[PDB]
Symmetry: D4
Subunit: 159 residues, 8 copies
């Protein structure tokens, strides 16, 4: 019932990308919340969100943003919870700015970074699932089924 | 019994991965450290990744440089969360390492950290934050470690 | 009759690119097989395919994939046969991630890499042809004709 | 009383930021120099930026390397103009520093300078040109400094 | 009445981008002029514009150009006023050439650089506003309102 | 009689190409090693490539750095498979070497290897795997070499 | 009557770009020839063209190609005439491969390189014009008029 | 009387530009060598470029690093052909130098050479090939120089 994963994104423009994380979590029946939190436009909203995440029962935070993407890193700065980052594809630099802004965190405050775009959003949800599966047998079995179906469903020849 | 497995493509990667090893030990997290080449010992990798969960491992930290396939292929064979450390390469300064690890397509995640030593240290910290989710004692040690890091930052530079 | 060249690709999405390799081989009447094999979604399928390629009579393997493209490298890890890699153009990084993931193989396990995209797929087939031509006189003559026609057909002035 | 605040992520940034300090002193601009980590001391940053205006600061010069979020997050909490200095990073030579600082989305600006020492010196000069707008005495000193720079350029190289 | 900010751009093609700076200044009721000045096609027009800017009462200059974008730097070469640069997105290199041409100014002549594209144009206007606000109480209050509205208007969840 | 030809643009390339030479000798593959400049001795290159097949060569390994045209132009004049080795360049670290070799348009292939020493060694191994297709004795030596490489990988790092 | 400038391009696909060079030369009434010459598909055509250019009365050669663009460099390898290179925008790497393949010529064989794309094609023609103007008074005057019109025609404000 | 002018942004550029100087002297081409800063001495540059033609100069070779505007701005003020040499920069290895010089929009050309020493030497050679068009004696010396370069290439490396 209560969310165990929090999906936060810099803006509505990131939804086209982060919706893939939302869909995957729902598919695996992982209770979660999906919100918009801007590191630069709503810094206090982020501080409060990240600082209280653990208290509220969250276990993993998936954060996505583009350009000078500080959302994942700053979220990790306030929480002890694992933070996964999704580099959203930017218009000009195609997410290279997003990627470097998120993955290059100095030692001390980590952000598990996924691929640029939709693939990254989907994988952040799967990585969050693999983390929760460590202490949730039922979910672990559903994740096994998901991975097994992925593998079995790959065609043998192109159409 | 090890709960985290640190694997790397070669002895040359140890200079970087030793930082992950030291941090896990610092936080009192039992782990194993091995060399597994995705290219030279593919079957060793398959077996290592396949059996990781049954052997008791909860998280795998994989480091490699250049065309770094170790993290991704490890993740392909295990349902456990896999964290990747891009080892700095001579010519491309780890950019090839970074892209070959972080850009996983949807379906098989690799939580990627920064290029080099910072990434190795952060892979260990991220692994710790994942384990802390179901280990109160470790959660406390991690909280203390994070709090100390924050309290240890100087207020002014030695000008 | 029996295939002497194997064309494998990471997914159906790579077909738009790899079809150019298929077409060229057919044009030169080189018996081949065209399959989908995912390094990360179907790792065991890849291990089995690459390991048994030589036994099955294959002489060259053309592998194409995009993003963190491990298909060519991992295929080369299990076979003694020459492996040619085609970097498929990725959405965000335009195949730069694909290229570095394939070409930057460390010493010991090579992958002859071609250009990003359609040109690369076509050239992988031609390179495979030039390899087979070394011990197939009939094919050698057909390849000579193909190269001669390419050269003679270039217009002298633009339209 | 300080009118410009120079902040940096760590002591390692001082080698670069000292150039901003020296230039402000040269132009007789009162300022403070502090270490504030966006990741290790997020609340220290929030408080510093929030109160800057009321404390009398007119401009903030922030320097950081790698995933450099200090300039952007500082700007998120202050209405004052914030200038960013990308500190050169080991692997990516400051490219990660540059993109993570300059690529701010619309709404929260960071006037970015060049990677390294030149950027730090220019951040100080830019701050000076901003203060000169309402400080006749400083405007005169700056004019003299610029005029001297121009007059000091040699006409031929020492061949 | 008289302009206090000058917006100059390399050509009509830059208008699609620089119009965002114009709109923001008008929104905050900051008197300004918007002109086309080419560093390479109209070098003398630029020299005269930049040299006389201060005399004419201008306080800040916002310059935007793409490709080998010299407009901001050369403008700064002739004026003591703060110059803000907007890298216009170029067709082939997506503004990376524009960005490096503007931000990498050597020590001695600064250019406060903003993000590539529309975001950068908007932020250059906001940065110019934050500079003018230092000595214009009425504007300072309007800027506070603008920043407050930006923060308060961010949705809490995606649509 | 040589069956593989190793050519390079200058003596400076030898530091890198010597690795290809050593490996071929190790596998007992007869070969020749020459310096041929695509830019300084274009006619020497034309003649070398044109006559390679009739001289008994089966594979050509070409190495060059910077604007590396040697591999591509060699391939333009021979029907034989040409392997390219991007030699590391001073400023761009071999990125210019890599792109100028691998990006061949459709019709004239160059199997490209990694930048530097690894690429040179792999060019030799790839050439060996091509020759092994019709040389049982060599095929056996290569199999033994690959098997030894796999068996020689340590299980743990010297911590 | 007889051509004094030769415009050569790798293929019909380059025409969309090189037509801008053709148009400019015609505009300035500079007699020229426009041809398709492929460095890799028609190497002998290139050797003959470049080798005999001077004898035929050509003074400048403008060469354009994309990807691993060797046309300009190899042309310069056979002629003593000034060779100007135009990097054609490639599909995946947007001309970055074209640019590095052309501009990074080692010492001894130069290629005056222009911008990627249409701008580069136009500028190659203008640069060729500025070269011919050194010893053709009539053309020199027409070039002066062209440059004067360019400067005078730049609008003062955007529409 | 000088027919070629070599200009550079600073004494630090001399280490690179001295190669252009030495080559012109080698070919007996009268020239002048000066330091002209586009940013620190903009009016000196305007005057230098404006009067170049009337002073007898036929070609200008300009070198600069980082945000290298010297070549482009020089070309903006002269009708003479301007050749640009990207001087290697500390952090970005001359990539910023290269893009800021070569990417000139249509209308004002700069024939760009390679980053560093090779580019400086080639700028001199390109200038020589331009002057040789109307100087028989020089044309002969250049022909001899090119012929010697070709004849001086070794046939095999010192293994």
């Amino acid at each position: 019932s209560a969310p165990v994963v929090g999906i936060i994104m810099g803006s509505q423009s990131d939804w086209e990308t982060m919706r893939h994380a939302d869909a995957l979590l729902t598919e695996l029946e992982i209770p979660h919340e999906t919100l918009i939190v801007s590191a630069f436009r709503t810094p206090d909203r982020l501080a409060d969100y990240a600082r209280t995440a653990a208290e509220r029962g969250l276990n993993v935070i998936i954060a996505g943003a583009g350009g000078a993407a500080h959302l994942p890193g700053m979220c990790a700065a306030w929480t002890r919870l694992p933070v996964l980052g999704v580099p959203v594809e930017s218009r000009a630099l195609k997410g290279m700015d997003s990627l470097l802004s998120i993955v290059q965190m100095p030692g001390g405050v980590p952000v598990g970074t996924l691929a640029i775009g939709a693939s990254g959003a989907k994988n952040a949800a799967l990585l969050a699932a693999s983390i929760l599966a460590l202490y949730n047998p039922a979910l672990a079995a559903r994740l096994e089924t998901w991975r097994a179906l992925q593998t079995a469903s790959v065609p043998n020849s192109p159409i």
